[PDB]
Paper text:
The long interspersed nuclear element-1 ([name]-1 or L1) retrotransposon is the only active autonomously replicating retrotransposon in the human genome. The EN initiates this pathway by creating a single-stranded nick in genomic DNA at the semi-specific 5′-TTTT*A-3′ consensus sequence, with the asterisk marking the location of the cleaved phosphodiester bond. Therefore, the EN plays a key role in beginning the process of creating and integrating a new L1 copy into the genome.
We used ZINCPharmer to generate the pharmacophore and filter the ZINC database for compounds that matched the pharmacophore, followed by docking with LeDock and AutoDock Vina. This provided a series of compounds with minor modifications to the fragment, while others were expanded into larger compounds more likely to inhibit activity. To choose compounds to test in vitro we used template docking with FitDock49, in which analogs were overlaid with the fragment’s location in the EN active site to serve as the initial location from which the docking calculations were completed. The inhibitors chosen from this group were AD41, AD43, and AD50 (Group 4).
Residue numbers in the entry: 6 to 239
């Protein structure tokens, strides 16, 4: 009745060397479900991503070696998919399914560097029909959601404020920030002027809060992004 969901922008998987490296890290972390961003695999190279122990994999890829997302499910986890929706451009993938008769919807997103919060709000609208009370939206938003997400505590811009409102209209909350309202933890440590920011996020339905046992930010040597882990009581 416990599953862990892990998100990491992996910064490219095209080379077999990097794929082998990612696989070892996953084996260690032993997540039930893993959301990866920036695989950079074109839609004709998706078959390249194989990780022993995580046979169920769902990918979304554009026509070029940029963006690219994947959701990997552990062989030990009974996830039964019912709907998969893939971005033509490789910036998100949504998987709906059930674990032990419990519905879960996972939207893995990689937002672009330019116009990130507007882009996420658009995807929310495009998929408004697919969001529900058991929805997790995780990945590299390429934007803070509040001042505490930046070591500078710079006010978030109007667009971000709009994204935050669209999220609340759908009864979606920043799950990390809700469990850790005062924390100053970061996932990207090369922000502009020697600054740090939390641009990776785990957002989710308010009704999932009762199931959230723990979150953990996992700094690593694989990527220029730290991973985020969520422990969920199914
Ligand atoms: N690499 C882009 C990333 C830099 C931090 C920035 C911020 O803190 O607003 C937004 C996203």
């Amino acid at each position: 009745s416990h599953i862990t969901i892990l998100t990491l922008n992996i910064n490219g998987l095209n080379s077999a060397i990097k794929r082998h490296r990612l696989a070892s890290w996953i084996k260690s972390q032993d997540p039930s479900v893993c959301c990866i961003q920036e695989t950079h695999l074109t839609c004709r190279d998706t078959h390249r991503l194989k990780i022993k122990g995580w046979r169920k994999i769902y990918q979304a890829n554009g026509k070029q070696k940029k963006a690219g997302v994947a959701i990997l499910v552990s062989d030990k986890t009974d996830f039964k998919p019912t709907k998969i929706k893939r971005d033509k451009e490789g910036h998100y993938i949504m998987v709906k399914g059930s674990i032990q008769q419990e519905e879960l919807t996972i939207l893995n997103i990689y937002a672009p560097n330019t116009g990130a919060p507007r882009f996420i709000k658009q995807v929310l609208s495009d998929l408004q029909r697919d969001l529900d009370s058991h929805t997790l939206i995780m990945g590299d938003f390429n934007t803070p959601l509040s001042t505490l997400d930046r070591s500078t505590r710079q006010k978030v811009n109007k667009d971000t404020q709009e994204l935050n409102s669209a999220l609340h209209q759908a009864d979606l909350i920043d799950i990390y920030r809700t469990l850790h309202p005062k924390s100053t933890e970061y996932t990207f440590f090369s922000a502009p002027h020697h600054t740090y920011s939390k641009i990776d996020h785990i957002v989710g339905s308010k009704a999932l809060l009762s199931k959230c046992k723990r979150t953990e930010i996992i700094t690593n040597y694989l990527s220029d992004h730290s991973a985020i882990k969520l422990e969920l009581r199914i």
